């Protein structure tokens, strides 16, 4: 069985490379961040532009929704994170503490905490309510490419150009595990699976891998795409077939069967690297976003 994603909408408006796209957990919205220093909000089903959210002084590399779809957090080259109230557009808090670009960010499932990763080689954990940094983890020896909480928020996974994925105890800040395979290419992305059992990691040797976190071993590898340079997001698609989704440096979106590792579809249309993809939480919808020569977001829909 294979999905049938087809281009439904192309979303224009960002004036520089788009850096990330994320669907709100309630399925109503798509948020995008960009090198143009802006966040844009779009209708998830119709692609219709909603609003722009501004305030960062330099480009944004990442943006993430709170569990209730009310808040966003953005990570910027201006070395801050900002917490936004989506409905009012207000910047609630500016998170200052990183000494270099903030590259990646996420709320915990409770959305009382934010985790961030930076070019300063650290992972920081912030209180959402106060904007105060609670812990600084000396996580890596190179820029941190991705940070993500597991299902109950007790663990943080981080990845880095240093070639490592590390798993941290949220409460204690202790490094519980370091994961690396037979080679040491930069790790460009990481995230826990929906059930919290696995870790999906991208490396800059054209490879995605599914890790059993508890056993500390690679279970599945997904190849066929091009990823040697950019920190491209990857997703678990769970609304229809169980797929792995990722952008690629050949300007395509790749979709693999999670279990069999076979490529099942490739989506063509972008004119630059697909840096970011997101999977709608209830509909078979994929959002894809591309870099500077393209500047657009595309919405694809399947009868899976």
């Amino acid at each position: 069985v294979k999905p049938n994603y087809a281009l439904k909408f192309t979303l224009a408006g960002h004036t520089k490379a788009v850096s990330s796209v994320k669907f709100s957990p309630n399925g109503e919205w798509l948020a995008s961040s960009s090198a143009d220093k802006l966040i844009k909000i779009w209708g998830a089903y119709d692609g219709k532009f909603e609003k722009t959210i501004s305030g960062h002084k330099l480009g944004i590399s990442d943006v993430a929704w709170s569990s209730d779809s009310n808040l966003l957090v953005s990570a910027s080259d201006d070395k801050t994170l900002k917490i936004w109230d989506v409905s009012s557009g207000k910047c609630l808090k500016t998170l200052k503490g990183h000494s270099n670009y903030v590259f990646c960010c996420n709320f915990n499932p409770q959305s009382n905490l934010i985790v961030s990763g930076s070019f300063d080689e650290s992972v920081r954990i912030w209180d959402v309510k106060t904007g105060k940094c609670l812990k600084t983890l000396p996580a890596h020896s190179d820029p941190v490419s991705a940070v993500h909480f597991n299902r109950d928020g007790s663990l943080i996974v981080s990845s880095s150009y240093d070639g490592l994925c590390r798993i941290w105890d949220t409460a204690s800040g202790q490094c519980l595990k370091t994961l690396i395979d037979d080679d040491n290419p930069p790790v460009s992305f990481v995230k826990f699976s929906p059930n919290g059992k696995y870790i999906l990691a991208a490396t800059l040797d054209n490879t995605l891998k599914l890790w059993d976190y508890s056993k500390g071993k690679c279970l599945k590898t997904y190849t066929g795409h091009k990823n040697e340079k950019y920190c491209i997001f990857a997703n678990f698609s769970v609304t229809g077939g169980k797929w792995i989704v990722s952008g690629s440096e050949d300007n395509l979106v790749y979709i693999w069967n999670l279990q069999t590792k076979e490529i099942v579809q490739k989506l063509q249309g972008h004119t630059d690297v697909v840096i970011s993809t997101a999977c709608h939480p209830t509909e078979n919808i994929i959002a894809s976003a591309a870099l500077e020569n393209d500047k657009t977001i595309k919405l694809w829909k399947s009868d899976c």
Partner: peptide, 7 residues
């Protein structure tokens, strides 16, 4: 414009 798009 941003670290991620620079790669």
């Amino acid at each position: 414009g941003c670290a991620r798009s620079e790669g």
